[PDB]
């Protein structure tokens, strides 16, 4: 159980997540005793959601879901239609519409597609929510993937002195299904996981949503930078290190003379 | 309130009527006539009879349309006066009743 | 009650899809999930066999010490492999390198002499030019055609920083006199997992044809072609990384706004910038 849970963690840590559902099926058909909180630890992909009473696309996640009834922020309704419509602050619901609107604009600014959905609620002093951006590898390019931006906005909204607190949890899945002739059958990708906090004296001109877009974008940039740098160069490091295109019988003597230069440095120091 | 389903609500129910203050003097009248009923049922087994009479007179017929303002304010002191007529009578009965009944001749005399 | 037969395909899928280096440890973890070796070995034996045959699993007999690779051209199926250079038949375990009883077999053996110098020059270049790049050229005279089988493995498995990566490639110089063919397939499987998933998988499979001359000409010819194609595609991969930074990222996640400079969130909060002009 517990040791099996650790095995499943290392499993998922090393399993190819393009088979999350089939790998999860292997996990259930292998250990159904630990079928309790599978997706609590195991990271899930995103799910399409189209409203029908309104007719607008939204997303399917954890907090919008009520048992099996997902909340539609277009109609603020639980699907399958239930009278169990436990909905949060209506004012914040409209503010959420504005937030998701701005973020749909934002995804149309940096992504031009996909769906953004920050499903929030209303806790005691603060609350939390989830940032959801579903944008797979578009058919416009044979290079594909599955962009899933799942983030947790954790607003520890204080009261005295118009201040509040923020905490961002992050993860963005995406593949690199680049199978061009020059790329052969290149495929790479994954997701990261980071966090950050904030203690802002939140005014009215810069709301919580503004902070969200700001630091979230900043985080995304850090992620993108980390990917592009560390992981790409890392892979290339391993490539050129293992399979090199460098003829030896030269580097030894040249570095030997360089060491002689270091000797000369020591001759004066 | 629960079917509204708006947000985290802070409504604290405040329930308090105005007939409570009137009920207070009425409860004093309850206990007054109650213990006075006990008094007229006790005074048989004799000056205490007339004492309870005059006390009940001077305290019941000064009710003043039983308004709780003067009820509490001054009729509470009038009830205290009634307690002193009654309290004194009870103490006297207890003191001499103890000394006499505790000095019975025999068991039959005790009966 | 789940049927444990499903777990056979579960662990088989786990074994086959396991990247090199990340196989025995999590495989034992899969056993911990199963708590049985018999149930595991119901299909894990065949899974071990094929998973090692295709992944170019390093094997090394003490009599030759060429660091041969687990494939099908030495294999017999009875945990007994054969030398692609001196045709010794020898038992060989698979959860470890327990090999014994060398038995030099016999075949047409002409092609063996050809692949001797072919693999000699090839292996010389591969050793003196690739760090962990090491090859093994199997040989088989099937269907009246000699087969030069080049198998290259290259890895560095030190996951202390949660990283692994391995290169494998098989190139066949199908000696079909007069015009032999240059057939071949690559194999890439790199993986990093310190806070982020990295699953690099790629290949290239091509084939050409040219008329047989002798041993040296065809040796340097075939190896030179594969050599340049690999270096060429390695350079292409470097450029693919260059195509990532500019195209791929901005093809999905752009870096700048439409004005390409900043984002005024309060301007999004209000003003209605002119959404009713045109």
For chain A, the 3-state helix, strand and coil shares in percent, each to the nearest 5, are 40, 25, 35
Contact yes or no for C234 and A240 at CB 8 A: yes
Tally of helices (H runs) and strands (E runs) in chain A: 7, 10
Q: Which residues of A touch C227 (CB under 8 A)?
A: none
Query: How far, CA to CA in Å, does C123 sit from each of B68, C59, C153, C155?
Result: 114, 16, 12, 16
∠ CA B77-B81-B82, nearest 5°, is: 115
Chain B residues in contact with A89 by the CB 8 A cut-off are 6-8
Q: What is the CA radius of gyration of chain C?
A: 25
Q: Which residues pair with A120 in a beta bridge?
A: A129
Asked if A26 is an interface residue toward chain C (Cβ–Cβ < 8 A), one would say yes
- By the CB < 8 Å criterion, does A95 face chain C? no
CA–CA separation, A47 and A149 (whole Å):
12
Q: How is residue B70 written in tokens?
A: 């003067």
- Assign 3-class secondary structure to B3-69: CCCCCCCCCCCCCCCCCHHHHHHHHHHHHHHHHHHHHHHHCCCCHHHHHHHHHHHHHHCCCCCCCHH
Q: How many CA atoms lie within 13 A of A102 on its CB side?
A: 24
For Cα atoms B72, B77, B83, give the angle at the middle one, nearest 5 degrees: 120
Cβ contact, residue pair A186, C202, below 8 Å: yes
A 203-242: CB under 8 A from C: 205-207, 209-210, 213-214, 217, 220-221, 224, 226-228, 231-236, 238-242
Q: Report the chain A residue with the minimal C-alpha distance to residue B3.
A: A86
CB C229: neighbour CB atoms within 10 A?
19
Nearest to A228 by CA among A192, A197, A194: A192
Which residues of chain B make contact with A90, given a CB cutoff of 8 A? Answer: 6-7
| Torsion from C-alpha of A245, A251, A254, A260, nearest 10 degrees | 140
Triad A90, A93, A95: Cα angle to 5° = 115
Indicate if the alpha-carbon torsion angle C247, C253, C255, C258 is positive or negative.
Answer: positive
- Residue A265 to chain C, least CA–CA distance (Å): 31
DSSP C123-189: HHHHHHHBSS-EEEEEEE-GGG-EEEEEEEEEE---GGGSEEEEEEEEEEEEE-SSEEEEEEEEEEE
Name, in order, each residue with C-beta under 8 angstroms of A219's C-beta and a sequence gap of 6 or more. A151, A168, A170, A194, A196
Helices (H), chain A: 2-14, 20-30, 38-41, 90-110, 208-226, 232-242, 251-268
- Whether chain C lies against chain B with 3 or more Cβ pairs closer than 8 A is no
Interface mutation vs chain A, best among B2, B6, B9, B10, most A CBs within 10 Å: B6
Q: Which residue of A has its CA nearest to C256?
A: A110
Measured CA to CA, the distance from residue A217 to residue C264 in angstroms comes to 13
Residues C201, C166: contact at Cβ < 8 Å?
no
| DSSP letter, residue A30 | H
Question: Residue A15 region, left (φ>0) first, then alpha (ψ -120 to 50), else beta?
Answer: beta
Residues in chain C: 278
d(CA A197, CA A257): 51
Nearest chain B alpha carbon to A89: B7
Distance from CA of B14 to the nearest CA of A (A): 22
CA C12 to chain centre: 19
Instruction: Please judge whether C32 and A224 are an interchain contact, meaning their C-beta atoms are less than 8 angstroms apart.
Output: no
Contact C36, C74 (CB under 8 A): no
Helix or strand run (H / E) with residue C55: none
Look-up of token digits 């877009």: A213
Best CA proximity match to A116, nearest among A198, A205, A241, A220: A220
Residue C52 near residue C23, CB atoms below 8 Å = no
Domains delineated in chain C: 1-107 (3.30.1140.60), 108-252 (3.90.1150.210)
Tokens 């503010």 correspond to A95
Do residues A118 and A132 lie in contact, with contact meaning Cβ atoms separated by under 8 Å?
yes
Q: Which residue from C126, C87, C125, C79 is spatially nearest to C103, judged by alpha carbons?
A: C87
CB of B110 closer than 8 Å to CB of B104: yes
Experimentally, the structure was elucidated by: cryo-EM
CA-CA distance, A199 to A189, in Å (whole number)? 33
User: Is it true that the peptide bond before C130 is cis, omega within 30 degrees of 0?
Assistant: no
Closest-CA distance of chain B to residue A93, Å: 10
Query: Which class for B24: exposed (0-12), middle (13-18), buried (19 or more C-beta within 10 A)?
Result: middle
Q: Residue B7: closest CA among chain A residues belongs to which residue?
A: A89
CB–CB of A160/A202 below 8 Å? Answer: no
Neighbours of chain C (3+ CB pairs under 8 A): A
Task: Classify burial at B59, counting beta carbons within 10 Å of its beta carbon; exposed 0-12, middle 13-18, buried 19 or more.
Answer: buried
Inter-chain CB proximity A123 and B8 less than 8 Å: yes
Q: Contacts of residue A171 in chain C, CB cutoff 8 Å?
A: none
C11/chain A closest Cα distance in angstroms = 8
Phi-psi label, residue C201: left if phi above 0, alpha if psi -120 to 50, beta otherwise: beta
The answer to whether C154 and C134 are in contact (CB under 8 A) is yes
Contact A139, A132 (CB under 8 A): no
The answer to whether A124 contacts B8, with C-beta atoms less than 8 Å apart, is yes
* Residues C13, C23: Cα–Cα separation, whole Å: 12
Measure the CA–CA gap between A145 and C244, rounded to whole angstroms: 13
The whole-angstrom separation of Cα C262 and Cα A109 is: 11
Q: CB under 8 Å to A188, separation ≥6 — which residues? A: A175, A176, A178, A235, C198, C199, C200, C201
- Cβ–Cβ below 8 Å for C244 and A232: yes
Q: Tell me which residue of A171, A184, A241 sits closest to C164, measured CA to CA.
A: A241
A122–B6: do the CB atoms touch at under 8 Å?
Answer: no
* B93 membership: H or E segment, kind and range: helix B75-101
Helix (H) or strand (E) holding C241: helix C215-243
Q: Is A243 exposed, middle or buried (0-12, 13-18, 19+ CB in 10 A)?
A: buried
A248 → closest Cβ in C128, C156, C230: C128
List of domains in chain A:
1-88 (1.20.58.570), 89-269 (3.90.1150.210)
């Amino acid at each position: 159980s517990d040791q099996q849970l650790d095995c499943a963690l290392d499993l998922m840590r090393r399993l190819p997540p393009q088979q999350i559902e089939k790998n999860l099926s292997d996990l259930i058909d292998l250990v159904p005793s630990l079928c309790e909180d599978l997706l609590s630890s195991v990271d899930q992909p995103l799910k399409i959601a189209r409203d029908k009473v309104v007719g607008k696309d939204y997303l399917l996640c954890d907090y919008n879901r009520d048992g099996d009834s997902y909340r539609s922020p277009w109609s603020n309704k639980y699907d399958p239609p239930l009278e169990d419509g436990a909905m949060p602050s209506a004012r914040l619901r409209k503010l959420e519409v504005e937030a998701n609107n701005a973020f749909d604009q934002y995804r149309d600014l940096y992504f031009e597609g996909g769906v953004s959905s920050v499903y929030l609620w209303d806790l005691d002093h603060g609350f939390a929510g989830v940032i959801l951006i579903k944008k797979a590898g578009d058919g416009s390019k044979k290079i594909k993937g599955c962009w899933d931006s799942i983030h947790v906005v954790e607003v520890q909204e204080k009261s005295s002195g118009r201040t509040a607190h923020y905490k961002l949890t992050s993860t963005v899945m995406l593949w690199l299904q680049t199978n061009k002739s020059g790329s052969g059958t290149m495929n790479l990708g994954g997701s990261l996981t980071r966090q950050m906090e904030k203690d802002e004296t939140v005014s009215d001109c810069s709301p919580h949503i503004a902070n969200i877009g700001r630091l979230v974008e900043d985080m995304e940039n850090k992620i993108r930078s980390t990917l592009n740098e560390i992981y790409f160069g890392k892979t290339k490091d391993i490539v050129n290190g293992l399979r090199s295109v460098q003829t030896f019988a030269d580097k030894s003597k040249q570095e030997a003379l360089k060491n002689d230069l270091v000797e000369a440095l020591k001759r004066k120091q | 309130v629960k079917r509204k389903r708006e947000e985290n609500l802070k409504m604290v129910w405040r329930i308090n009527p105005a007939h409570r203050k009137l009920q207070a003097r009425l409860d004093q009248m309850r206990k007054f006539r109650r213990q006075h009923e006990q008094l007229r049922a006790v005074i048989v087994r004799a000056n205490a009879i007339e004492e309870v009479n005059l006390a009940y007179e001077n305290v019941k017929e000064v009710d003043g349309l039983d308004v709780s303002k003067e009820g509490t304010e001054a009729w509470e002191a009038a009830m205290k006066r009634y307690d002193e007529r009654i309290d004194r009578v009870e103490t006297r009965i207890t003191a001499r009743l103890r000394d006499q009944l505790g000095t019975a001749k025999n068991a039959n005399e005790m009966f | 009650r789940v049927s444990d037969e499903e777990k056979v395909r579960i662990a088989a899928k786990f074994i086959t899809h396991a990247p090199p280096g990340e196989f025995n440890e999590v495989f034992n973890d899969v056993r911990l999930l199963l708590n049985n070796d018999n149930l595991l070995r119901e299909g894990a034996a065949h899974a071990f066999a094929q998973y090692n045959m295709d992944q170019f699993t390093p094997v090394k007999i003490e009599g030759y010490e060429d660091q041969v690779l687990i494939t099908e051209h030495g294999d017999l199926g009875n945990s007994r492999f054969l030398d692609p250079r001196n045709k010794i038949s020898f038992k060989f375990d698979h959860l470890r390198k327990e090999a014994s009883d060398p038995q030099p077999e016999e075949v047409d053996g002409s092609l063996k002499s050809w692949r001797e110098s072919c693999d000699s020059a090839l292996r010389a270049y591969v050793k003196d030019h690739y760090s962990n790049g090491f090859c093994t050229v199997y040989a088989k005279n099937i269907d009246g055609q000699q087969t030069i089988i080049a198998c290259i493995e290259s890895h560095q498995f030190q996951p202390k920083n949660f990283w692994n990566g391995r290169w494998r490639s098989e190139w066949k110089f199908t000696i079909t006199p007069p015009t032999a063919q240059v057939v071949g397939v690559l194999k890439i499987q790199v993986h990093y997992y310190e806070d982020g998933n990295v699953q690099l998988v790629s290949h290239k499979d091509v084939q050409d044809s040219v008329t047989v001359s002798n041993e040296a000409q065809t040796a340097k010819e075939f190896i030179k072609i594969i050599e340049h194609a690999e270096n060429e595609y390695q350079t292409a991969i470097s450029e693919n990384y260059q195509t990532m930074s500019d195209t791929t990222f901005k093809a999905l996640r752009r870096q700048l706004p439409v004005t390409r400079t900043k984002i005024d969130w309060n301007k999004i909060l209000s003003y209605k910038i002119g959404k009713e002009m045109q």
